[PDB]
Design a protein around this ligand. Structure first.
Ligand SMILES: [Mg+2]
Lengths: 70, 172, 29
RNA sequence: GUCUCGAGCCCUAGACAGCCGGGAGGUGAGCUUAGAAGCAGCUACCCUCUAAGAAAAGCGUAACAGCUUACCGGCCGAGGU
């Protein structure tokens, strides 16, 4: 019953709407530990065995919005 | 080129001159396979189609002869069957088998019955809105099925509106 | 002999230690 | 239409074609929009599982659905382009 990826990002970022062009226009920002929490929740929604690979899937939506990493 | 077709155990094949006769539990089919320098013979339990010529035109008929023989094999054992469905929008169409021909009455409200003679030892059986054309000779069976569909061909009016007629549904 | 077909055999053999033709190929050696 | 000659690339580690099977998750990508979920538009076009499987090639729907596409596996077996 866990909600989609897009929502959880907007929760722990502060911003709602994305941008017309991703990566070219950075909207929000996420840290190392912040993205680690999202991967902890989605387990059945993701096919990955290790916790490492689960994060890669999540990032596959962030950069295509305008979210830099620190 | 030389092609060898191993004849099925159910089947027995004889041949004299240019005619080949193939017999099985489902009946017999005889065909005349005639083309320049293409010899078709029965060497025991194998039918041989050979020629010293190997040009495009000769190779074409050789491939054609093979399928004709393989089809005769299939027809005298498993047989050939085509399925047809009779569809009508307004006027109830009457499709029946009368002797050696299928008769279609009241087609599009016509007074005059449309009809077509059945080819060879082909059997046409109708179960309500379904028809099944079958027999050993795919030529006769395939034609009879096609003839029935062609029998309700409409030239004068828009076919997208007037679609009544028996259609080939299942092809072997 | 496509390189991907060679890299595959090596990858299969690596798992045997620890396409059907490539599986057999790996089995053989 | 057919005959002859030459060059490139592919192929028994199985080519070309056909048939069978798979064509999967993140999530309906984001934006736009009341909604648009491969397929209105703009922009991006990224990574998981894996033998493959597009941020979707052609239809399809009001939008979905659904049908095929690439792509992978099998059957077949000799030339294919
Ligand atoms: Mg007119």
């Amino acid at each position: 019953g866990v909600p989609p990826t897009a929502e959880l990002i907007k929760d722990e970022a502060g911003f709602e709407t994305g941008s017309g062009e991703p990566q070219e226009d950075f909207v929000a920002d996420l840290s190392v530990d912040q993205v680690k929490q999202i991967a902890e929740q989605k387990h059945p929604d993701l096919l990955s065995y290790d916790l490492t690979n689960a994060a890669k899937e999540v990032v596959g939506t962030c950069t295509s919005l305008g979210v830099t990493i620190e | 080129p030389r092609v060898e077709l191993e004849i099925p155990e159910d089947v027995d094949a004889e041949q004299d001159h240019l005619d080949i006769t193939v017999e099985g539990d489902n009946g017999s089919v005889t065909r005349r396979l005639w083309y320049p320098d293409i010899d078709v013979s029965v060497d025991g339990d194998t039918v041989v189609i050979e020629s010293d010529e190997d040009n495009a035109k000769t190779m074409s008929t050789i491939g054609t002869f093979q399928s004709h023989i393989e089809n005769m094999f299939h027809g005298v054992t498993e047989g050939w069957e085509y399925g047809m469905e009779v569809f009508y929008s307004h006027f109830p169409m009457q499709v029946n088998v009368e002797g050696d021909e299928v008769v279609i009455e009241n087609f599009l409200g016509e007074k005059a019955p449309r009809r077509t003679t059945i080819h060879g030892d082909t059997d046409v059986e109708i179960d309500g809105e379904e028809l099944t054309v079958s027999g050993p000779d795919i030529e006769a069976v395939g034609q009879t099925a096609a003839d029935i569909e062609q029998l309700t061909r409409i030239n004068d009016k828009d076919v997208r509106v007037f679609q009544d007629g028996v259609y080939i549904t299942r092809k072997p | 002999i496509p390189e991907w077909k060679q890299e595959e055999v090596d990858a299969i053999v690596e798992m045997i230690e620890s396409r059907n033709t490539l599986l057999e190929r790996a089995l053989d050696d």
